[PDB]
């Protein structure tokens, strides 16, 4: 909504720091699968 | 878990604010923990109680229950997480930077690194010539003491562990009991 | 934000300020985004 | 004006006077007629005095009469100003919700009370600066240590999970 995205399975606002940490955890090979070359 | 409750009392004074610790003391008694009952015992405003509860929800100290009456019990597992973050801080504090004596004239306040020193050196003068002005680049000394800071930071961080060692040992004994 | 976070605020103000920081950084890169209202320094002038 | 006798608010003033003499420290049992003589309202008229006893005194919700003489409506408890440390000793009652507003009128000025509170083990925590006052003891166990909040500040993960798992892997 406007500037913030909320996830409902309890619609908690998403955390950019949390999303950044998940992105670091995400494997390079799966990142290539979704169309982003890792390097 | 009477020993765990005693350990919880020590940690709430050490980490939580005095207003939060009094609310946590109400949580320690599990015979009755209604949101209304907790509010009356605290004597705080409902909005003030809600703000304390929101901090506890982020801490994971309290778990929401449906009865509507809300029942609060001690589910905090971040006491170890906070202690480990402090341990990471101790490792970060000891691991600062090296000597890297930076030649810098305080007149022009320009920190030229030991690598930049060869450019500063002039053969005719025979001394590291301050390129920005006309003086001689002086040693950083007290200024920018990264090497001095790491030892002092490590010593201060090391002092914290013995005071918390008894609480950490009690937490370790509880972890051994949990298996 | 850094000084208030270092002091340790209640975080109710921190939640409002971080959204304002997000608005400021987003406004600089894009002004055509839906929402994100244009900021005028003076004389009804749109930012670029 | 519903039901009123003579000057408006006379009944409420009589209850306020009963509280005031107790705060003054001069305590005496007073009949309604005796209170009227003390407040110079003795010539309130026979009908007005009868109305106060029959309806106005009964109307007050918290009014308490021990027997022959009425007692102050606002505070049933005596303002002893003593055994506060015993109230602090039981944290279950949180000092029975003691308020500094009740104190400072019992027998001592605020300036004396502020010096006494700092010297005494008893400490006061006020969530609202003037609206409410509470008494608590944190003991000497709590430790400021070094950068205690700053270590918490490093842990800004909060809701995000598995951060502890990374620390556990480093610990291994
Ligand atoms: Zn210079």
Closest-CA distance, C34 to chain D, in angstroms, reads: 29
Same domain, D112 and D90: yes
Domain, as residue range, for D65: 8-79
Touching check for A13 and chain C: CB below 8 Å?
Answer: no
Whether A37 has its CB under 8 Å from any CB of chain C: the answer is no
> Is B48 exposed, middle or buried (CB count within 10 Å of its CB: 0-12, 13-18, 19+)?
middle
Whether D156 is covered by a domain: the verdict is yes
State which approach was used to obtain the coordinates.
cryo-EM
Among D44, D61, D79, the domain boundary falls at D79
Following DSSP, what letter does each residue of chain D receive, concatenated? --S--SSTTHHHHHHHHHHHHHHHT------HHHHHHHTT-S-S-HHHHHHIIIIIHHH-SS-EE-SSSEE-SS-SS------HHHHHH-TTTTGGG--TTTTTSSSS-HHHHHHHHHHSS-EEE-SSSSS--EEE--TTT---TTTHHHHHHH---TT--SHHHHHHHHH-
B-D CB pairs within 8 A amount to: 76
Put residue B117 in one of left, alpha, beta given phi > 0 → left and psi -120 to 50 → alpha: alpha
Nearest residue on chain D to B167, judged by CA atoms? D141
Beta strands in chain B (DSSP E): 121-122, 127-128
Separation CA B81–CA B60 (nearest Å): 12
**Kind and range of the H or E run holding C15:** helix C12-29
Cross-strand pairs, A12: A7
D21 and D73 fall within a common domain: yes
CB-CB contact of B27 with B72 (8 Å): yes
Statement to judge: residues D68 and D129 lie in one domain: no
Q: Which residues of B touch D159 (CB under 8 A)?
A: 58
Cβ-proximal residues to B21 (8 Å cutoff; 6+ apart), any chain: B12, B13, D138, D142
Chain C residues within 8 A of B55 when measuring between CB atoms: 11
Are residues D104 and D121 both part of a single domain? yes
- Around Cβ B56, how many Cβ atoms within 10 Å? 21
Which SS3 state, helix, strand or coil, does residue C45 take? coil
The angle at the Cα of B72, spanning B67 to B74, to the nearest 5 degrees, equals 145
In a domain, D16, yes or no: yes
Residues D88, D89, D92: CA angle, nearest 5 degrees: 85
Cα dihedral sign for D109, D112, D118, D119?
negative
**CA D130 to ligand 1 center in whole angstroms:** 57
The β-bridge partners of B127 are B122
D61 and D88 belong to one structural domain: no
Q: What is the resolution of this structure in A?
A: 4.1
For residue D2, tell me if it sits in a domain: no
Closest CA to B158 of D56, D145, D12, D37: D145
Distance B151 CA to ligand 1 centre (A): 29
Q: What's the structural domain count of chain D?
A: 3
3-class secondary structure, B104:
coil
């Amino acid at each position: 909504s406007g500037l913030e995205l909320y996830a409902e399975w309890k619609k908690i606002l998403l955390s950019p720091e949390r999303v950044h940490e998940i992105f670091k955890r995400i494997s390079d090979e799966e990142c290539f699968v979704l169309g982003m070359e890792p390097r | 878990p009477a020993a765990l409750k005693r350990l919880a009392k020590y940690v709430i004074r050490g980490f939580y604010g005095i207003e939060h610790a009094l609310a946590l003391d109400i949580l320690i008694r599990n015979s009755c923990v209604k949101e209304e009952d907790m509010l009356e015992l605290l004597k705080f405003d409902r909005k003030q109680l809600r703000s304390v509860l929101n901090n506890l929800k982020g801490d994971k100290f309290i778990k929401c229950r449906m009865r509507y009456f809300i029942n609060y019990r001690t589910l905090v597992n971040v006491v170890k997480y906070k202690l480990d973050h402090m341990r990471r801080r101790i490792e970060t504090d000891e691991r600062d930077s090296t000597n890297r004596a930076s030649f810098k004239c305080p007149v022009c306040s320009s920190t030229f690194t030991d690598l930049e020193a060869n450019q500063l050196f002039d053969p005719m003068t025979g001394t590291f010539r301050c390129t920005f002005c006309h003086t001689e680049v002086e040693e950083d000394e007290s200024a920018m003491p990264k090497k001095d800071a790491r030892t002092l930071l490590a010593r201060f961080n090391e002092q914290i562990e013995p005071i918390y060692a008894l609480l950490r040992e009690t937490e370790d004994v509880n972890l051994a009991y949990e298996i | 934000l850094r000084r208030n976070e270092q002091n340790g605020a209640a975080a109710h103000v921190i939640a409002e300020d971080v959204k304002l920081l997000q608005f400021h950084v987003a406004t600089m890169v894009d002004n055509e985004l839906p929402g994100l209202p244009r900021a005028m320094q003076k004389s009804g002038r749109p930012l670029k | 004006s519903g039901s009123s006798g003579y000057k408006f608010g006379v009944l409420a003033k009589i209850v306020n006077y009963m509280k005031t003499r107790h705060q003054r420290g001069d305590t005496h049992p007073l009949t309604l007629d005796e209170i009227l003589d003390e407040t110079q309202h003795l010539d309130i008229g026979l009908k007005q005095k009868q109305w106060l006893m029959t309806e106005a005194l009964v109307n007050n919700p918290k009014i308490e009469v021990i027997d022959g003489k009425y007692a102050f409506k606002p505070k049933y408890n005596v303002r002893d100003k003593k055994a506060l440390l015993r109230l602090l000793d039981q944290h279950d009652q949180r000092g029975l919700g003691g308020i500094l507003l009740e104190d400072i009128e019992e027998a001592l000025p605020n300036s004396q009370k502020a010096v006494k509170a700092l010297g005494d083990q008893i400490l006061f925590v006020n969530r609202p600066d003037k609206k409410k006052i509470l008494f608590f003891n944190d003991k000497s166990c709590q430790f400021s240590v070094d950068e205690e909040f700053q270590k918490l500040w490093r842990s800004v993960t909060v809701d995000s999970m598995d951060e502890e798992k990374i620390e556990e892997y480093l610990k291994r």
